[PDB]
Symmetry: C3
Subunit: 115 residues, 3 copies
Amino acid sequence: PCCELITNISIPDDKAQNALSEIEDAISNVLGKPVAYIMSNYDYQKNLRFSGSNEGYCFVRLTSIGGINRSNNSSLADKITKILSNHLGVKPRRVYIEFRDCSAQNFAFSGSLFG
Amino acid sequence: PCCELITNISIPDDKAQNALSEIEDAISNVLGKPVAYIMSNYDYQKNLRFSGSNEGYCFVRLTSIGGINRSNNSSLADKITKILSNHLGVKPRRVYIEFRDCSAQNFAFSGSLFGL
Amino acid sequence: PCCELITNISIPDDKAQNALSEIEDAISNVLGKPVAYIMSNYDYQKNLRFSGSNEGYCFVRLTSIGGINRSNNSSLADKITKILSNHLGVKPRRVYIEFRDCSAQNFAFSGSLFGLE
């Protein structure tokens, strides 16, 4: 899976990676996938807006080959938002998460398709 | 909705905000969705290329739960491209816009899915 | 097409430009799309992680109006991974590539939707 965090909250690199490590653990747990398959990123975007304001906010795009369904989506939405709130101080009502399914024929690793 | 502007054009933060604000209003006008539901971003990407060159360029990805259709896309393509040319000085022929539909079951806010 | 490279590998601007140009040429060759239609980017993301670490890694998202299929995806996976390994020194095992199809009706250029309809 790939987890893209985009946020206007600035924290030091060690803290950023801490938050990602916890998000990686949640993804691994919920999707039943090893850490070996998980990409994550903390993208600091100073001009990011939500509801017409530059107040602290997070957007997460989570892309996975399978595992995108109501049960997993709900569980991860809860867990990821909690992590972001705790680690970044963001209000839960300023956290958006998008879930994307990708087919194995449309994803490559080490120069070859998964499918 | 989410409106991601990716550009190699650099303007100060307040002016970046101003440009995004105008885009939000266009989105609100066309989709009928108030700014309360709209995320926007100005991502300065110095190495961004289009048509084989580093000339001033903008890519916009607009993701929305519904309202992705020919009439709405056509209207927003026109409006957003004009806003970018006005505020960033980008040539119309160096503006790409992608429209993405997303299901409510695949989108979460405040720790919960949008879908029932 | 749009080719978004996201990486924690730092290289000089001119070298990033060189790498993107080669990726463009590969996309053009496989998909048949002119360079005139290709957007590309090198997004340096210092905290990008894969497999639990900040070790050298590349993620590429390639979006195109058509041309997304087994044969094209396979060929570009090979070509792009080789370019990245050559230019950035990334190991192939730390290169992910996602392929995305988009309808012409959902894509605009110069303020107008692509296609006729």
